[PDB]
Amino acid sequence: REFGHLTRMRHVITYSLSPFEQRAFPHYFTKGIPNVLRRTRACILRVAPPFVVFYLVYTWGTQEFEKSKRKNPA
């Protein structure tokens, strides 16, 4: 497991450039923000609801505990 015999690959042509000839932040905001919104839209529906149900149960538990501490007119 080291460089030299990792695997076999053929007919692959790859290009790149020197770090001293291209911008380090190529339009960091022109496509960065749309990319962020795209990933957020992709993951929001599967990330948020488990946290929102936790938010509701936390609030309900806190309020019910406070109510239980109050006297219950007896």
Binding site: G4, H5, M9, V12, Y15, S16, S18
Partner: protein, 440 residues
Amino acid sequence: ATYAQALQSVPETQVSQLDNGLRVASEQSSQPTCTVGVWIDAGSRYENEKNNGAGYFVEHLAFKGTKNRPGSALEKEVESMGAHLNAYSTREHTAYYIKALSKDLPKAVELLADIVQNCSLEDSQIEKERDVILQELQENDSSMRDVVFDYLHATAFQGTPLAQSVEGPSENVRKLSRADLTEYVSQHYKAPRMVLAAAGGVEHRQLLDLAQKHFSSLSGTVPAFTPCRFTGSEIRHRDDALPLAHVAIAVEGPGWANPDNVPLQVANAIIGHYDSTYGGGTHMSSTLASVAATRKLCQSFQTFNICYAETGLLGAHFVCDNMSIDDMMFFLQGQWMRLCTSATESEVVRGKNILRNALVSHLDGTTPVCEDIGRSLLTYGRRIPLAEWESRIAEVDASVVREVCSKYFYDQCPAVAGLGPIEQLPDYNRIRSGMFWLRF
């Protein structure tokens, strides 16, 4: 006979210039054989994206047929008198030269005058030459060294005509109508961009008479290339089924001008060259060659100084197995920085002697002398005498080599081109980091 006397005993190459602009040059020493050649300033550097490969096609069709001599008859005249006709078209130069006898010089020019000015460009010849070019492109695809060098040119001169290959893309070769060839001949085979060089036993007066009598009808008395740019990059063609891994790494060097060529050619001579079938091996002076021979780290390595007019590629190309690319990169880069940081006088003297031998050995025989005359007239604007070369070698010392190597090597973004099982080739960040020494 103390070298310097021999150097000043070399016959000079007189230069004349016709009204059309053809630069006629000759160098008579003793020989009954001569090499007479027309050097054009045309090549792949001048063709655009659509004309790429037109120079190759024109060179291919040049010998097949002419106007005065219909087709194969031309070859007859070359073969009947024993002359050997040849042509080579690099990226920025083209040349058609025949080797003949001294007696056959009056005929030798005439055939040449037929080839360059009034070709045939027969359509059926174009049709067959198209298939010939396609198959030749396949052969060059099999040529791993040439493929690697073309990849280096593509990745170094990206976005410039210099990156274009001489043969041109295979798609272009198909279209390549006869009108394009005629236009390319018209605007790239003009008289001012021609050098009529003739080595061997040719008299300059006779050469002038024949050139005037056979080349006067040419155009008497505009795209003239543009400064290309260096784009430090790398192209990696991972083809693991290939036996060896051809790699070539180059940096922006000097041009035909910029006398820094003389010191750099010394420094490259210090690195030298070596392959599997060599002599002393481990005993070679070059540290890279000695290490490679001792550890069997290579099957070949070479140092190249490809220099065009505005720029050029200066670097090294090595052929080694898939398990020695990284060590090769380390050792080659370390040798480069060793030359940059501390060149030593003895190494510089060895390089000076090697470079002195290079020019004199190369300038032996009629054909190399004629080729040198043509190339020097086109590039330098003059034929540089060997005495001036000797003086330039003499002026080179350790400090000059160190300074020029630091100018061209130290902390520069290189252009890399690998092909074959090159997965062990260090990443471009590692390669660039190897181009600066923290200790220094």
